[PDB]
PDB file of C-alpha atoms in Angstrom:
ATOM      1  CA  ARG A  89      66.255 -30.741 -65.800  1.00 12.92           C
ATOM      2  CA  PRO A  90      66.830 -27.117 -68.225  1.00 12.90           C
ATOM      3  CA  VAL A  91      70.303 -26.644 -67.592  1.00  9.09           C
ATOM      4  CA  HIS A  92      71.670 -22.861 -67.984  1.00  9.90           C
ATOM      5  CA  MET A  93      75.691 -22.163 -68.344  1.00 10.82           C
ATOM      6  CA  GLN A  94      77.332 -19.242 -66.432  1.00 10.07           C
ATOM      7  CA  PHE A  95      80.516 -17.777 -67.028  1.00 13.10           C
ATOM      8  CA  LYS A  96      81.898 -16.442 -63.729  1.00 17.73           C
ATOM      9  CA  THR A  97      84.115 -14.099 -63.643  1.00 17.22           C
ATOM     10  CA  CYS A  98      87.172 -14.754 -61.526  1.00 12.84           C
ATOM     11  CA  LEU A  99      87.429 -11.035 -60.830  1.00 13.13           C
ATOM     12  CA  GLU A 100      90.326  -9.722 -62.597  1.00  8.30           C
ATOM     13  CA  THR A 101      93.428 -11.524 -60.656  1.00  8.51           C
ATOM     14  CA  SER A 102      93.943 -14.680 -58.616  1.00 10.28           C
ATOM     15  CA  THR A 103      94.484 -11.929 -55.517  1.00  4.75           C
ATOM     16  CA  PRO A 104      91.158 -11.792 -53.593  1.00  4.79           C
ATOM     17  CA  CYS A 105      89.961  -8.291 -55.128  1.00  2.76           C
ATOM     18  CA  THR A 106      86.460  -7.964 -54.603  1.00  2.00           C
ATOM     19  CA  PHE A 107      84.697 -12.166 -55.424  1.00  2.25           C
ATOM     20  CA  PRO A 108      84.081 -13.909 -58.231  1.00  2.00           C
ATOM     21  CA  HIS A 109      80.704 -11.968 -60.507  1.00  2.00           C
ATOM     22  CA  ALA A 110      77.709 -13.691 -62.437  1.00  2.00           C
ATOM     23  CA  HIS A 111      74.850 -13.010 -63.819  1.00  2.00           C
ATOM     24  CA  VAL A 112      73.533 -13.819 -67.198  1.00  2.00           C
ATOM     25  CA  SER A 113      70.378 -15.451 -67.172  1.00  2.00           C
ATOM     26  CA  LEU A 114      67.800 -14.488 -70.126  1.00  2.00           C
ATOM     27  CA  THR A 115      64.673 -18.197 -70.515  1.00  2.00           C
ATOM     28  CA  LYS A 116      61.466 -15.990 -70.549  1.00  2.00           C
ATOM     29  CA  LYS A 117      59.231 -19.208 -71.666  1.00  2.00           C
ATOM     30  CA  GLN A 118      60.960 -20.871 -68.733  1.00  2.00           C
ATOM     31  CA  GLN A 119      60.564 -17.980 -66.732  1.00  2.00           C
ATOM     32  CA  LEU A 120      56.635 -17.777 -66.727  1.00  2.00           C
ATOM     33  CA  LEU A 121      56.482 -21.723 -66.753  1.00  2.00           C
ATOM     34  CA  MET A 122      58.597 -21.543 -63.085  1.00  2.00           C
ATOM     35  CA  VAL A 123      55.920 -18.326 -62.244  1.00  2.00           C
ATOM     36  CA  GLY A 124      52.442 -20.779 -62.934  1.00  2.00           C
ATOM     37  CA  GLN A 125      53.454 -24.061 -62.162  1.00  2.00           C
ATOM     38  CA  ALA A 126      56.150 -23.506 -58.648  1.00  2.00           C
ATOM     39  CA  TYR A 127      59.614 -24.437 -59.878  1.00  2.00           C
ATOM     40  CA  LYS A 128      62.829 -24.126 -58.422  1.00  2.00           C
ATOM     41  CA  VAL A 129      66.094 -23.464 -58.866  1.00  2.14           C
ATOM     42  CA  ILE A 130      69.066 -25.551 -58.021  1.00  4.33           C
ATOM     43  CA  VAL A 131      73.340 -24.023 -59.123  1.00  2.00           C
ATOM     44  CA  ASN A 132      76.040 -27.218 -59.105  1.00  2.00           C
ATOM     45  CA  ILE A 133      80.039 -26.400 -59.378  1.00  2.00           C
ATOM     46  CA  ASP A 134      82.191 -28.821 -60.782  1.00  2.00           C
ATOM     47  CA  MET A 135      85.194 -28.450 -58.521  1.00  2.00           C
ATOM     48  CA  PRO A 136      88.813 -31.230 -58.889  1.00  2.09           C
ATOM     49  CA  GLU A 137      90.652 -32.152 -55.929  1.00  4.58           C
ATOM     50  CA  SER A 138      93.001 -29.612 -56.053  1.00  3.82           C
ATOM     51  CA  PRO A 139      95.105 -29.535 -53.061  1.00  2.90           C
ATOM     52  CA  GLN A 140      93.841 -26.088 -53.005  1.00  3.73           C
ATOM     53  CA  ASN A 141      90.623 -27.206 -53.575  1.00  7.26           C
ATOM     54  CA  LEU A 142      91.454 -29.337 -50.609  1.00  6.79           C
ATOM     55  CA  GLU A 143      92.208 -27.623 -48.276  1.00  4.03           C
ATOM     56  CA  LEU A 144      89.185 -25.096 -48.534  1.00  3.00           C
ATOM     57  CA  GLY A 145      86.655 -26.386 -46.878  1.00  3.39           C
ATOM     58  CA  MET A 146      83.233 -25.313 -45.964  1.00  2.00           C
ATOM     59  CA  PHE A 147      82.272 -22.042 -48.196  1.00  2.00           C
ATOM     60  CA  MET A 148      79.436 -19.851 -48.682  1.00  2.00           C
ATOM     61  CA  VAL A 149      76.630 -18.715 -52.114  1.00  2.00           C
ATOM     62  CA  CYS A 150      74.966 -17.032 -52.305  1.00  2.00           C
ATOM     63  CA  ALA A 151      72.096 -15.931 -54.676  1.00  2.00           C
ATOM     64  CA  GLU A 152      69.996 -13.096 -55.627  1.00  2.00           C
ATOM     65  CA  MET A 153      66.510 -12.346 -57.951  1.00  2.00           C
ATOM     66  CA  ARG A 154      66.336  -9.202 -59.727  1.00  2.00           C
ATOM     67  CA  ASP A 155      63.218  -8.955 -61.621  1.00  2.00           C
ATOM     68  CA  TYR A 156      62.079  -7.299 -64.878  1.00  2.00           C
ATOM     69  CA  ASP A 157      61.552  -4.313 -63.313  1.00  2.00           C
ATOM     70  CA  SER A 158      65.299  -4.680 -61.813  1.00  2.00           C
ATOM     71  CA  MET A 159      63.949  -4.806 -58.175  1.00  2.00           C
ATOM     72  CA  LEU A 160      65.745  -7.385 -55.996  1.00  2.00           C
ATOM     73  CA  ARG A 161      62.753  -9.875 -54.990  1.00  2.00           C
ATOM     74  CA  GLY A 162      64.522 -12.444 -53.292  1.00  2.00           C
ATOM     75  CA  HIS A 163      68.061 -12.995 -51.500  1.00  2.00           C
ATOM     76  CA  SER A 164      69.402 -16.538 -50.261  1.00  2.00           C
ATOM     77  CA  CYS A 165      72.883 -17.188 -48.587  1.00  2.00           C
ATOM     78  CA  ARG A 166      74.055 -20.687 -48.901  1.00  2.00           C
ATOM     79  CA  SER A 167      76.177 -22.674 -47.581  1.00  2.00           C
ATOM     80  CA  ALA A 168      78.686 -25.558 -49.358  1.00  2.00           C
ATOM     81  CA  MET A 169      81.992 -27.527 -48.786  1.00  2.00           C
ATOM     82  CA  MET A 170      82.894 -30.433 -50.709  1.00  2.00           C
ATOM     83  CA  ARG A 171      82.621 -33.832 -50.525  1.00  2.00           C
ATOM     84  CA  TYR A 172      85.458 -34.958 -47.714  1.00  2.00           C
ATOM     85  CA  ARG A 173      87.348 -38.350 -48.564  1.00  2.00           C
ATOM     86  CA  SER A 174      89.914 -39.275 -46.933  1.00  2.00           C
ATOM     87  CA  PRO A 175      93.547 -39.893 -48.416  1.00  2.00           C
ATOM     88  CA  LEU A 176      93.697 -43.006 -48.069  1.00  2.00           C
ATOM     89  CA  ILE A 177      90.491 -43.919 -49.834  1.00  2.00           C
ATOM     90  CA  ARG A 178      91.613 -41.304 -52.157  1.00  2.00           C
ATOM     91  CA  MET A 179      94.693 -43.366 -53.195  1.00  2.00           C
ATOM     92  CA  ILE A 180      91.942 -46.843 -53.766  1.00  2.00           C
ATOM     93  CA  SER A 181      90.200 -45.408 -55.422  1.00  2.00           C
ATOM     94  CA  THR A 182      92.753 -44.582 -57.428  1.00  2.00           C
ATOM     95  CA  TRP A 183      94.334 -47.471 -57.969  1.00  2.00           C
ATOM     96  CA  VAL A 184      91.052 -49.652 -58.117  1.00  2.00           C
ATOM     97  CA  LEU A 185      89.300 -47.280 -60.894  1.00  2.00           C
ATOM     98  CA  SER A 186      92.845 -46.736 -61.764  1.00  2.00           C
ATOM     99  CA  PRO A 187      91.827 -47.636 -65.891  1.00  2.00           C
ATOM    100  CA  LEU A 188      89.116 -45.671 -66.099  1.00  2.00           C
ATOM    101  CA  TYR A 189      91.136 -42.199 -64.872  1.00  2.00           C
ATOM    102  CA  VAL A 190      93.864 -43.510 -67.503  1.00  2.00           C
ATOM    103  CA  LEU A 191      91.367 -43.547 -70.173  1.00  2.00           C
ATOM    104  CA  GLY A 192      90.093 -40.020 -69.424  1.00  2.22           C
ATOM    105  CA  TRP A 193      86.064 -41.561 -68.724  1.00  2.00           C
ATOM    106  CA  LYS A 194      85.971 -40.014 -64.829  1.00  2.00           C
ATOM    107  CA  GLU A 195      87.723 -36.980 -64.131  1.00  2.00           C
ATOM    108  CA  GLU A 196      88.814 -36.377 -60.512  1.00  2.00           C
ATOM    109  CA  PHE A 197      86.173 -33.549 -60.095  1.00  3.77           C
ATOM    110  CA  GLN A 198      83.228 -33.375 -57.955  1.00  2.00           C
ATOM    111  CA  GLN A 199      79.429 -32.273 -58.916  1.00  2.84           C
ATOM    112  CA  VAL A 200      78.102 -30.774 -55.761  1.00  2.00           C
ATOM    113  CA  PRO A 201      74.844 -29.565 -56.220  1.00  2.00           C
ATOM    114  CA  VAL A 202      73.589 -26.507 -53.941  1.00  4.11           C
ATOM    115  CA  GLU A 203      69.797 -25.712 -54.097  1.00  3.69           C
ATOM    116  CA  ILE A 204      69.784 -22.080 -53.481  1.00  2.00           C
ATOM    117  CA  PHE A 205      65.278 -21.992 -53.283  1.00  2.00           C
ATOM    118  CA  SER A 206      62.661 -23.923 -53.209  1.00  2.00           C
ATOM    119  CA  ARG A 207      59.592 -21.289 -55.107  1.00  2.00           C
ATOM    120  CA  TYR A 208      58.568 -19.667 -58.095  1.00  2.00           C
ATOM    121  CA  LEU A 209      59.446 -16.205 -58.820  1.00  2.00           C
ATOM    122  CA  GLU A 210      57.625 -14.075 -55.920  1.00  2.00           C
ATOM    123  CA  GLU A 211      54.458 -12.637 -58.535  1.00  2.00           C
ATOM    124  CA  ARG A 212      52.902 -12.855 -62.227  1.00  2.00           C
ATOM    125  CA  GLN A 213      53.554  -9.600 -62.610  1.00  3.27           C
ATOM    126  CA  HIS A 214      57.283  -9.162 -62.889  1.00  3.19           C
ATOM    127  CA  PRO A 215      59.103 -12.291 -62.310  1.00  3.27           C
ATOM    128  CA  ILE A 216      63.222 -12.396 -61.984  1.00  4.96           C
ATOM    129  CA  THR A 217      65.365 -12.477 -65.294  1.00  6.75           C
ATOM    130  CA  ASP A 218      68.756 -12.764 -63.897  1.00  8.02           C
ATOM    131  CA  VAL A 219      70.058 -14.272 -60.497  1.00  8.87           C
ATOM    132  CA  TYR A 220      73.125 -12.298 -58.734  1.00  9.56           C
ATOM    133  CA  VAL A 221      75.575 -14.962 -57.835  1.00  9.87           C
ATOM    134  CA  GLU A 222      78.779 -15.042 -56.095  1.00  9.10           C
ATOM    135  CA  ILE A 223      81.177 -17.542 -54.450  1.00 11.54           C
ATOM    136  CA  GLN A 224      82.456 -16.306 -50.712  1.00 11.71           C
ATOM    137  CA  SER A 225      85.933 -16.915 -50.858  1.00 11.05           C
ATOM    138  CA  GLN A 226      89.314 -16.666 -53.575  1.00 10.27           C
ATOM    139  CA  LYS A 227      91.479 -20.044 -53.013  1.00 12.28           C
ATOM    140  CA  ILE A 228      87.802 -22.203 -55.201  1.00 12.99           C
ATOM    141  CA  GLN A 229      89.192 -23.577 -58.490  1.00 13.06           C
ATOM    142  CA  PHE A 230      86.328 -25.074 -60.723  1.00 11.47           C
ATOM    143  CA  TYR A 231      85.784 -25.827 -63.798  1.00  8.45           C
ATOM    144  CA  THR A 232      82.036 -24.743 -64.741  1.00 12.17           C
ATOM    145  CA  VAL A 233      79.072 -23.328 -62.971  1.00 11.90           C
ATOM    146  CA  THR A 234      75.842 -24.335 -63.902  1.00 14.60           C
ATOM    147  CA  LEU A 235      72.315 -23.638 -62.469  1.00 14.78           C
ATOM    148  CA  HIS A 236      69.403 -25.883 -63.335  1.00 15.68           C
ATOM    149  CA  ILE A 237      65.708 -24.303 -62.834  1.00 12.05           C
ATOM    150  CA  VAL A 238      64.254 -27.740 -62.033  1.00 14.58           C
ATOM    151  CA  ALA A 239      60.499 -28.372 -63.021  1.00 15.84           C
ATOM    152  CA  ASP A 240      59.834 -29.413 -59.888  1.00 14.19           C
ATOM    153  CA  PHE A 241      57.323 -28.325 -57.174  1.00  9.24           C
TER     154      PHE A 241
ATOM    155  CA  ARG B  89      86.097 -24.779 -88.371  1.00  6.73           C
ATOM    156  CA  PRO B  90      87.950 -22.272 -90.167  1.00  8.83           C
ATOM    157  CA  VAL B  91      91.472 -22.216 -87.707  1.00  7.73           C
ATOM    158  CA  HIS B  92      92.984 -18.727 -86.819  1.00  6.65           C
ATOM    159  CA  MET B  93      96.601 -18.521 -85.412  1.00  4.52           C
ATOM    160  CA  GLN B  94      97.646 -15.340 -83.108  1.00  2.00           C
ATOM    161  CA  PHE B  95     100.699 -14.234 -82.461  1.00  2.00           C
ATOM    162  CA  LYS B  96     100.410 -13.424 -78.130  1.00  2.00           C
ATOM    163  CA  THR B  97     103.175 -11.472 -77.164  1.00  2.00           C
ATOM    164  CA  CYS B  98     104.571 -11.978 -74.379  1.00  2.00           C
ATOM    165  CA  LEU B  99     105.058  -8.786 -73.648  1.00  2.00           C
ATOM    166  CA  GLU B 100     108.592  -8.100 -73.319  1.00  2.00           C
ATOM    167  CA  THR B 101     109.887  -9.889 -70.358  1.00  2.00           C
ATOM    168  CA  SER B 102     109.104 -13.009 -67.882  1.00  2.00           C
ATOM    169  CA  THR B 103     108.563 -10.570 -65.143  1.00  2.00           C
ATOM    170  CA  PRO B 104     104.744  -9.055 -65.395  1.00  2.00           C
ATOM    171  CA  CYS B 105     104.660  -5.449 -67.390  1.00  2.00           C
ATOM    172  CA  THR B 106     101.520  -5.613 -68.184  1.00  2.00           C
ATOM    173  CA  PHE B 107     100.080  -8.527 -69.540  1.00  2.00           C
ATOM    174  CA  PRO B 108     100.270 -10.035 -73.285  1.00  2.00           C
ATOM    175  CA  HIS B 109      98.823  -9.214 -76.315  1.00  2.00           C
ATOM    176  CA  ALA B 110      97.011  -9.698 -79.231  1.00  2.00           C
ATOM    177  CA  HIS B 111      94.295  -9.097 -82.351  1.00  2.00           C
ATOM    178  CA  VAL B 112      95.486 -10.465 -85.717  1.00  2.00           C
ATOM    179  CA  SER B 113      92.374 -11.432 -87.137  1.00  2.00           C
ATOM    180  CA  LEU B 114      91.480 -10.715 -90.882  1.00  2.00           C
ATOM    181  CA  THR B 115      88.754 -13.497 -92.488  1.00  2.00           C
ATOM    182  CA  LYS B 116      86.145 -10.764 -94.361  1.00  2.00           C
ATOM    183  CA  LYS B 117      84.594 -13.375 -95.690  1.00  2.00           C
ATOM    184  CA  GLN B 118      84.069 -15.682 -92.791  1.00  2.00           C
ATOM    185  CA  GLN B 119      83.493 -12.142 -91.136  1.00  2.00           C
ATOM    186  CA  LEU B 120      79.857 -11.595 -92.885  1.00  2.00           C
ATOM    187  CA  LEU B 121      79.354 -15.343 -93.682  1.00  2.00           C
ATOM    188  CA  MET B 122      79.279 -15.481 -89.571  1.00  2.00           C
ATOM    189  CA  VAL B 123      77.075 -12.426 -89.562  1.00  2.00           C
ATOM    190  CA  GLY B 124      74.616 -13.817 -91.419  1.00  2.00           C
ATOM    191  CA  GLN B 125      74.648 -17.110 -90.540  1.00  2.00           C
ATOM    192  CA  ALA B 126      74.843 -16.481 -86.568  1.00  2.00           C
ATOM    193  CA  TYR B 127      78.460 -18.590 -86.084  1.00  2.00           C
ATOM    194  CA  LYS B 128      80.282 -17.804 -82.773  1.00  2.00           C
ATOM    195  CA  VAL B 129      84.012 -18.188 -81.605  1.00  2.00           C
ATOM    196  CA  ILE B 130      85.891 -20.529 -79.405  1.00  2.00           C
ATOM    197  CA  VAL B 131      89.755 -19.868 -78.255  1.00  2.00           C
ATOM    198  CA  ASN B 132      91.851 -23.114 -77.399  1.00  2.00           C
ATOM    199  CA  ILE B 133      94.883 -22.887 -75.951  1.00  2.00           C
ATOM    200  CA  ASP B 134      97.755 -25.067 -76.138  1.00  2.00           C
ATOM    201  CA  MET B 135      99.140 -25.468 -72.480  1.00  2.00           C
ATOM    202  CA  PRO B 136     102.351 -28.298 -71.082  1.00  2.00           C
ATOM    203  CA  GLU B 137     102.352 -29.733 -67.914  1.00  2.00           C
ATOM    204  CA  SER B 138     105.057 -27.428 -66.375  1.00  2.00           C
ATOM    205  CA  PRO B 139     105.298 -27.182 -63.348  1.00  2.00           C
ATOM    206  CA  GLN B 140     104.876 -23.524 -62.978  1.00  2.00           C
ATOM    207  CA  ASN B 141     101.884 -24.232 -65.201  1.00  2.00           C
ATOM    208  CA  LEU B 142     100.689 -27.113 -62.997  1.00  2.00           C
ATOM    209  CA  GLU B 143     101.063 -24.395 -60.048  1.00  2.00           C
ATOM    210  CA  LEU B 144      98.853 -22.038 -61.706  1.00  2.00           C
ATOM    211  CA  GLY B 145      95.162 -22.988 -61.436  1.00  2.00           C
ATOM    212  CA  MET B 146      92.775 -21.115 -62.630  1.00  2.00           C
ATOM    213  CA  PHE B 147      93.481 -17.905 -64.862  1.00  2.00           C
ATOM    214  CA  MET B 148      90.756 -14.990 -66.467  1.00  2.00           C
ATOM    215  CA  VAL B 149      90.925 -14.552 -70.348  1.00  2.00           C
ATOM    216  CA  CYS B 150      89.044 -11.805 -71.945  1.00  2.00           C
ATOM    217  CA  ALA B 151      88.351 -10.788 -75.627  1.00  2.00           C
ATOM    218  CA  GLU B 152      86.865  -7.427 -77.500  1.00  2.00           C
ATOM    219  CA  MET B 153      85.350  -6.952 -80.334  1.00  2.00           C
ATOM    220  CA  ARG B 154      85.827  -3.770 -82.231  1.00  2.00           C
ATOM    221  CA  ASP B 155      84.476  -3.639 -85.643  1.00  2.00           C
ATOM    222  CA  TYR B 156      85.415  -1.642 -88.959  1.00  2.00           C
ATOM    223  CA  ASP B 157      85.169   1.408 -87.877  1.00  2.00           C
ATOM    224  CA  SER B 158      86.658   0.634 -84.929  1.00  2.00           C
ATOM    225  CA  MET B 159      84.243   0.325 -82.495  1.00  2.00           C
ATOM    226  CA  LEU B 160      84.580  -1.688 -79.014  1.00  2.52           C
ATOM    227  CA  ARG B 161      81.201  -3.737 -80.277  1.00  3.01           C
ATOM    228  CA  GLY B 162      81.609  -6.352 -77.295  1.00  2.76           C
ATOM    229  CA  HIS B 163      83.246  -7.475 -74.563  1.00  4.13           C
ATOM    230  CA  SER B 164      83.941 -10.966 -72.283  1.00  2.34           C
ATOM    231  CA  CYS B 165      86.071 -11.881 -70.177  1.00  2.71           C
ATOM    232  CA  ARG B 166      86.247 -15.691 -69.743  1.00  2.88           C
ATOM    233  CA  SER B 167      87.367 -17.890 -66.749  1.00  2.00           C
ATOM    234  CA  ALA B 168      89.776 -21.109 -67.328  1.00  2.87           C
ATOM    235  CA  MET B 169      92.096 -23.723 -65.652  1.00  5.54           C
ATOM    236  CA  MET B 170      93.983 -26.801 -66.558  1.00  5.07           C
ATOM    237  CA  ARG B 171      91.982 -30.025 -66.579  1.00  3.33           C
ATOM    238  CA  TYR B 172      93.110 -31.330 -62.573  1.00  4.20           C
ATOM    239  CA  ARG B 173      95.334 -34.256 -62.762  1.00  8.58           C
ATOM    240  CA  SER B 174      96.121 -36.584 -59.471  1.00  8.16           C
ATOM    241  CA  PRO B 175     100.367 -37.179 -59.627  1.00 11.47           C
ATOM    242  CA  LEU B 176      99.530 -41.030 -59.127  1.00 11.18           C
ATOM    243  CA  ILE B 177      97.382 -40.318 -62.179  1.00  8.95           C
ATOM    244  CA  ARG B 178      99.977 -38.749 -64.013  1.00  6.69           C
ATOM    245  CA  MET B 179     102.070 -41.185 -62.677  1.00  4.91           C
ATOM    246  CA  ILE B 180     100.361 -44.344 -63.825  1.00  7.05           C
ATOM    247  CA  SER B 181      99.317 -42.360 -67.569  1.00  8.76           C
ATOM    248  CA  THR B 182     103.422 -42.236 -67.847  1.00 11.46           C
ATOM    249  CA  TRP B 183     104.357 -45.340 -66.742  1.00  9.93           C
ATOM    250  CA  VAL B 184     101.261 -46.988 -68.903  1.00 10.24           C
ATOM    251  CA  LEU B 185     101.482 -44.964 -72.168  1.00 10.66           C
ATOM    252  CA  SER B 186     105.075 -44.361 -71.996  1.00 13.92           C
ATOM    253  CA  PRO B 187     105.977 -45.825 -75.821  1.00 14.57           C
ATOM    254  CA  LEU B 188     103.952 -43.064 -77.561  1.00 13.14           C
ATOM    255  CA  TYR B 189     105.612 -40.116 -75.553  1.00  9.36           C
ATOM    256  CA  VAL B 190     108.596 -41.457 -76.395  1.00  7.63           C
ATOM    257  CA  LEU B 191     108.026 -41.585 -79.771  1.00  8.74           C
ATOM    258  CA  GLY B 192     106.642 -38.118 -79.386  1.00  8.61           C
ATOM    259  CA  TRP B 193     102.441 -39.284 -80.622  1.00  8.69           C
ATOM    260  CA  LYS B 194     101.375 -37.706 -77.449  1.00  8.97           C
ATOM    261  CA  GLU B 195     103.601 -34.551 -75.679  1.00 12.74           C
ATOM    262  CA  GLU B 196     102.016 -33.917 -72.506  1.00 12.11           C
ATOM    263  CA  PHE B 197     100.042 -30.964 -73.247  1.00 11.87           C
ATOM    264  CA  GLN B 198      96.153 -30.251 -72.638  1.00  9.77           C
ATOM    265  CA  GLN B 199      94.130 -28.324 -75.264  1.00 14.47           C
ATOM    266  CA  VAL B 200      91.793 -26.113 -73.448  1.00 13.76           C
ATOM    267  CA  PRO B 201      89.379 -24.386 -75.189  1.00 13.53           C
ATOM    268  CA  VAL B 202      87.489 -21.028 -73.911  1.00 13.51           C
ATOM    269  CA  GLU B 203      83.980 -20.256 -75.052  1.00 11.92           C
ATOM    270  CA  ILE B 204      83.799 -16.680 -75.544  1.00 15.34           C
ATOM    271  CA  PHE B 205      81.634 -16.001 -77.529  1.00 18.59           C
ATOM    272  CA  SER B 206      77.528 -17.507 -78.702  1.00 20.12           C
ATOM    273  CA  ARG B 207      76.321 -15.267 -81.999  1.00 19.91           C
ATOM    274  CA  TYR B 208      77.099 -12.792 -84.298  1.00 21.32           C
ATOM    275  CA  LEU B 209      78.524  -9.813 -84.639  1.00 21.95           C
ATOM    276  CA  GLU B 210      75.837  -7.698 -83.220  1.00 23.74           C
ATOM    277  CA  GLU B 211      74.876  -6.076 -86.578  1.00 24.76           C
ATOM    278  CA  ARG B 212      75.218  -6.329 -90.248  1.00 22.92           C
ATOM    279  CA  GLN B 213      76.611  -2.659 -91.022  1.00 24.84           C
ATOM    280  CA  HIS B 214      79.618  -2.492 -88.892  1.00 26.41           C
ATOM    281  CA  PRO B 215      81.180  -6.307 -88.396  1.00 25.76           C
ATOM    282  CA  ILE B 216      83.900  -7.247 -85.952  1.00 24.25           C
ATOM    283  CA  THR B 217      87.680  -6.993 -87.620  1.00 25.93           C
ATOM    284  CA  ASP B 218      90.112  -8.195 -84.947  1.00 27.63           C
ATOM    285  CA  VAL B 219      89.747  -9.719 -81.306  1.00 28.44           C
ATOM    286  CA  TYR B 220      92.073  -7.541 -78.657  1.00 27.07           C
ATOM    287  CA  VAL B 221      93.003 -10.894 -76.525  1.00 24.63           C
ATOM    288  CA  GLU B 222      94.760 -10.952 -73.200  1.00 24.94           C
ATOM    289  CA  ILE B 223      95.305 -13.722 -71.024  1.00 25.12           C
ATOM    290  CA  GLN B 224      95.141 -12.399 -66.547  1.00 23.17           C
ATOM    291  CA  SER B 225      98.185 -14.028 -65.731  1.00 21.26           C
ATOM    292  CA  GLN B 226     102.047 -13.864 -66.074  1.00 19.46           C
ATOM    293  CA  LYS B 227     102.665 -17.505 -65.186  1.00 15.33           C
ATOM    294  CA  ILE B 228     101.612 -19.105 -67.906  1.00 19.97           C
ATOM    295  CA  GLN B 229     103.217 -20.906 -70.401  1.00 17.30           C
ATOM    296  CA  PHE B 230     102.164 -22.340 -73.083  1.00 19.91           C
ATOM    297  CA  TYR B 231     103.440 -23.110 -76.867  1.00 22.38           C
ATOM    298  CA  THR B 232     100.224 -21.480 -79.057  1.00 20.86           C
ATOM    299  CA  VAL B 233      97.433 -19.834 -79.180  1.00 23.76           C
ATOM    300  CA  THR B 234      94.590 -20.338 -81.607  1.00 23.30           C
ATOM    301  CA  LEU B 235      90.765 -19.495 -82.474  1.00 23.48           C
ATOM    302  CA  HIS B 236      88.046 -20.707 -83.929  1.00 25.41           C
ATOM    303  CA  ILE B 237      85.208 -19.227 -85.780  1.00 26.64           C
ATOM    304  CA  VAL B 238      82.865 -22.156 -85.731  1.00 27.36           C
ATOM    305  CA  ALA B 239      80.558 -22.948 -88.175  1.00 26.34           C
ATOM    306  CA  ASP B 240      78.134 -22.719 -85.705  1.00 24.81           C
ATOM    307  CA  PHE B 241      74.344 -21.106 -84.690  1.00 22.53           C
TER     308      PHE B 241
END
């Protein structure tokens, strides 16, 4: 339920120098409420129906857990893929819901949530401050990336 | 709310010599009102639906913070991308709103705001005068670039 906004830096080139780069995170009160109540975290990426985005297919995403002592406490790489639609059903959804997309009320993108972890930050002594996120691709196009440390056991 | 207009110099060639170049900024009273009241800054780029602009996709943008002592106090590179539209919905928005674009009332461009910072200029002793902006591309086409040191905590 508390949203968390991140500036995924796209590796100073369109060409794949390394990978996208991340880890801005500081909610210490929600860090403690995650540990004491066994909450979890989920990332959510907003990406359009670009032809480069539709040619992408499956991609990996990965996240880390570095504590207040900057020690790596958790590491999980996750699989992800857009919700595939046929071009016929994209044309039909275009023609049917046309005045919505004309008035800019739906915006031809998809929210792709990727569940990263299920439990808390491994101990009460040194919980996790930032999360080193990277997407294992370079042809991906997206609008924004948002974590969600949800209040869910 | 105070607007700030910048002359982004396009690197003396259409070919990528280096990168676009920037940093004209002088509002010392608004500099002090940013520091004393924890304001933030956001850039906004006006770019058309050119075929070179639509082929561009994601690009990085980056900004610096050099103070009255000309010391680099802050540095943030940011991700950006146009709001993607399908060619079907561009044709439908063309045919529906046609007399607006004929009379030159909407102008087939997009304003893309990119939030750069969230807080003030790092101290009251030597706040930031100019902002070294660069766009990490050379195929980008735009009309103008405008910062907004908004009065927002």
